[PDB]
């Protein structure tokens, strides 16, 4: 098992994009091997499929539907296979890019179950899945209303550990750069204000997330300025970028 | 009210000038029937 | 080629369209690839030399994969020329399909000429893209084959195809006016038609290409419009328009017109109700302009436009900045007597603010339109009063207007009243 799979990968890496020729031979067999493989080999095959997909890139579209079905069947609460599949998700997202939004709805049910019940020590499987969601990019447009509540519950939960809370906040920061967040202004700003009370450690990260959100909302943020200012004074939060952005919004200058 | 004329504001609505696109250059490096070496096009690719 | 087109129009804009789908990607050193005589070698062409031969007023359209690299190196050679000038930047417009890092999409459903199609046939890809989104599930039985056989033309606004083109022109001109600063709007969307059309259709390209990890690039950088509320309205407008297509093609049903323009005028009216305060201007102002072009909703728009101008001189300034003047002046060629009380009202408000428009009214012989209204006993005395003011402005300290109204026999008409 191991020897055969490794050789095929090294061949494709050394060839480059000329390996696309061999796709119709390799893929159907390789997928049927993942189906009937057992135990440890499964994890290794999914790792090597990730490499394959990273090399094939856009050309993997015909076989993508089967791969998702495979993932859907073999996703389990086993910590090991979850980290593996999340890595395989990150490689499918960079490979397909814009075409990933066709397949994302199949994966969403499993991602929402990961947040609901993650028993991972320090929720490191959650942090990994956040790092993946960052790659999803403008694919998340039609599904942001589904993904965002779990992320918001993640960084507002006090029981949850600080690393996993920073990971959620940094994710919302990144997604603000690419997605539209006007719809979900209240759903985020109110947990943030609440986070700036319940924990002084996240105050820095949260304020950076807030400023980014402010930059994206613009004049639509005007409503919240009284309420957020009240929370800032209560703990003397004096952020350079944020105070600049507010000052610009009230003035009305656009930049 | 005072018997006084209202000061006319600086009406800047007028267009400074009207441009006219006199001619158009369609440089087409289509290279029909040949594929650029840099990009390895997929078999279906985009034909239209 | 470029030197000849520059000779023809030395002081006028010249369009340079470049389609590099068949040549290798542009280099970091500011070069673009062409062929040799035999078509055996890709020859590079420096952007510096390319921007040497073309002159100052020009516009560049790059439809290739790493098109950002061209725009960067173009601005470099622009700065490099400015440094050499001591011991052509604002004039040169540039549109680019992609950012330097990005690649063009390879998706078999879309045309290879995705960018040019957007710029030059917006409605065609707009409907094809509409049929590719997830929102098609809400309208079953609308495939691409029905879009191919959509009836109508792009001119006839009473047809289904001409309706969408008209709506699209309104929506794009509205997004631009609300998002861009007034200065940059009149620069791009009012100066000349073709540029305004390209940037109008560029806003659609920005939205569509965004959905395939592509970012178009412009030389005068625009703020991101992809998330504007009006885009959602465009979806519904399309939805209602081509939900009828099964019945129009197969059953032969009469195409009912869209409620879009009606509902947008309804929104503008609701704003006017509590519009006394100087709050944010109404989003729908450029739509009211687009409505004036037809006759179907012309009476209602002329009414609302007058009610708006009444609010104050600040509002008349806005309506003149959006560009209402040449359309209100064109309506003075109409003979529909129902327009007479509305145009008299609108023109009194305009000439009260900007008295310089007396020049335009004499040129187009619009002073005859009003002379007729001032010699109509059945016209109410309120509207006849506005007409006498309009004439008293056209004539005011302006020998051309005094000589023109004298020949139009004003003194005899005035003495009658």
């Amino acid at each position: 098992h191991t020897m055969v799979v490794q050789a095929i990968t090294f061949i494709f890496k050394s060839l480059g994009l000329k390996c696309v020729q061999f796709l119709p031979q390799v893929m159907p067999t390789f997928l049927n091997v993942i189906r009937v493989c057992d135990g440890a080999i499964r994890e290794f095959l999914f790792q090597q499929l990730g490499m394959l997909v990273s090399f094939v890139k856009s050309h993997i579209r015909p076989y993508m539907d089967e791969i998702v079905t495979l993932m859907r069947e073999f996703w389990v609460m086993n910590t090991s296979i979850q980290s593996t599949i999340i890595l395989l998700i990150e490689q499918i997202v960079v490979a397909l890019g814009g075409e990933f939004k066709l397949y994302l709805p199949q994966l969403i049910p499993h991602m929402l179950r990961v947040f609901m019940h993650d028993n991972s020590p320090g929720r490191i499987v959650s942090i990994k899945l956040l790092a993946a969601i960052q790659l999803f990019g403008a694919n998340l447009d039609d599904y942001l209303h589904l993904l965002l509540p779990p992320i918001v519950k993640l960084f507002d939960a006090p029981e949850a550990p600080l690393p996993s809370r920073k990971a959620a906040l940094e994710t919302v920061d990144r997604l603000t750069e690419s997605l539209d967040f006007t719809d979900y202004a209240s759903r985020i700003i109110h947990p943030i204000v609440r986070t700036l009370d319940q924990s002084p450690e996240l105050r820095s990260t949260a304020m950076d997330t807030l400023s980014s959100l402010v930059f994206q909302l613009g004049k639509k943020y005007q409503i919240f300025i009284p309420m957020v200012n009240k929370v800032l004074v209560r703990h003397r939060i004096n952020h350079q970028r944020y105070d600049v952005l507010i000052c610009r919004i009230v003035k009305g200058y656009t930049l | 009210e005072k018997i006084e004329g209202s000061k006319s504001l600086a009406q800047s609505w007028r267009m400074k000038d009207r441009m006219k696109t006199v001619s158009v250059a369609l440089v087409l490096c289509l290279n029909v029937g040949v594929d650029p070496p840099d990009v390895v096009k997929t078999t279906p690719c985009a034909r239209l | 080629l470029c030197t000849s087109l520059r000779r023809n129009a030395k002081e006028e804009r010249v369009l340079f369209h470049y389609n590099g789908h068949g040549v290798p990607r542009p280099t970091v050193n500011g070069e673009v690839w062409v062929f040799n005589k035999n078509y055996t070698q890709y020859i590079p062409l420096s952007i510096y030399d390319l921007q040497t031969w073309m002159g100052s007023p020009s516009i560049f359209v790059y439809d290739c994969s790493n098109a950002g690299l061209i725009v960067k190196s173009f601005k470099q050679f622009a700065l490099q020329r400015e440094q050499e000038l001591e011991v052509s930047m604002k004039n040169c417009i540039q549109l680019a399909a992609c950012e330097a890092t990005e690649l063009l999409p390879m998706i078999p459903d879309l045309p290879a000429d995705l960018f040019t199609s957007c710029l030059t046939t917006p409605i065609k890809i707009a409907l094809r893209w509409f049929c590719m989104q997830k929102c098609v599930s809400l309208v079953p039985g609308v495939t691409l084959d029905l879009i191919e056989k959509i009836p109508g033309r792009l001119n006839d606004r009473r047809t289904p195809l001409g309706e969408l083109n008209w709506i699209f022109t309104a929506i794009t001109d509205t997004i631009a006016w609300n998002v861009l600063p007034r200065d940059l709007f009149q620069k791009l969307f009012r100066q000349d038609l073709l540029v305004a059309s390209l940037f109008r259709n560029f806003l659609l390209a920005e939205r569509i290409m965004r959905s395939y990890n592509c970012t178009p690039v412009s030389s005068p950088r625009l703020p991101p419009t992809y998330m504007h509320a009006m885009w959602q309205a465009w979806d519904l407008a399309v939805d209602i328009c081509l939900s009828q297509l099964p019945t129009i093609i197969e059953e032969g049903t009469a195409f009912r017109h869209s409620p879009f323009f009606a509902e947008q005028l309804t929104a503008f009216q609701v704003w006017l109700t509590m519009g006394v305060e100087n709050r944010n201007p109404p989003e729908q102002l450029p739509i009211v302009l687009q409505v004036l072009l037809s006759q179907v909703h012309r009476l209602r728009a002329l009414d609302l436009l007058g009610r708006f101008l009444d609010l104050g001189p600040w509002a008349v300034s806005l309506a003149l900045s959006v560009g209402i003047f040449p359309y209100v002046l064109k309506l003075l060629q109409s003979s529909a007597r129902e327009l007479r009380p509305l145009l008299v009202f609108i023109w009194a408000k305009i000439l009260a603010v900007d008295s310089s428009c007396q020049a335009d009214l004499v040129k187009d012989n619009g002073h005859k339109y009003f002379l007729s209204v001032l010699a109509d006993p059945y016209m109410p005395a309120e509207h006849r009063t506005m007409t006498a003011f309009i004439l008293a402005v056209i004539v005011n300290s302006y020998h051309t207007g005094q000589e023109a109204c004298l020949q139009g026999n004003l003194i005899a008409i005035c003495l009658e009243q």
Side-chain angles (χ1 to χ4, degrees), chain B residues 11-15 18-27 29-31 36-38 41-42 44-46 48, chain C residues 5 12-13 15 17-19 21-22 25 35 42 108 112-113 182 186 191-193 325 353-354 356-357 360:
Chain B
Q11 298 299 124
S12 63
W13 66 274
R14 299 279 193 180
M15 299 300 304
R18 166 83 219 267
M19 191 58 66
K20 174 185 172 56
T21 308
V22 176
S23 63
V24 177
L26 306 184
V27 174
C29 296
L30 295 174
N31 211 7
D38 285 15
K41 295 185 178 174
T42 322
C45 72
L48 278 317
Chain C
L5 295 173
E12 291 297 324
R13 193 154 301 269
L15 176 58
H17 181 94
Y18 172 72
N19 192 297
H21 288 123
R25 294 176 284 92
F35 307 86
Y42 297 112
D113 216 12
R182 196 177 70 77
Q186 273 138 49
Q191 261 193 334
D192 60 356
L193 305 209
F325 189 84
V353 173
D354 193 38
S356 72
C357 316
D360 293 301

Side-chain angles (χ1 to χ4, degrees), chain B residues 16 19, chain C residues 13 51 55-60 74-79 81-82 85 88-95 181 183-188 191-192 195 199 218-221:
Chain B
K16 182 174 298 298
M19 191 58 66
Chain C
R13 193 154 301 269
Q51 77 175 239
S56 64
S58 53
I59 163 159
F60 296 83
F74 194 97
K75 281 193 285 179
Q76 278 198 327
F77 291 131
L79 294 165
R81 280 168 180 283
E82 290 293 338
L85 201 74
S88 62
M89 163 46 179
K90 291 187 95 292
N91 304 337
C92 294
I93 288 155
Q94 315 181 62
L95 307 176
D183 302 49
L184 196 261
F185 177 81
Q186 273 138 49
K187 183 175 261 74
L188 301 183
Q191 261 193 334
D192 60 356
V195 169
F199 278 97
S218 56
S219 200
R221 187 187 193 186

Side-chain angles (χ1 to χ4, degrees), chain A residues 219, chain C residues 177 267-284 308 311 314 318:
Chain A
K219 291 184 76 179
Chain C
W177 190 74
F268 184 64
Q269 191 185 64
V270 168
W271 189 89
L272 292 163
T273 62
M274 298 186 58
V276 222
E277 326 98 16
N278 296 33
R279 49 182 183 178
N280 292 353
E283 283 90 329
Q284 295 86 19
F308 179 71
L311 296 177
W314 58 273
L318 273 178

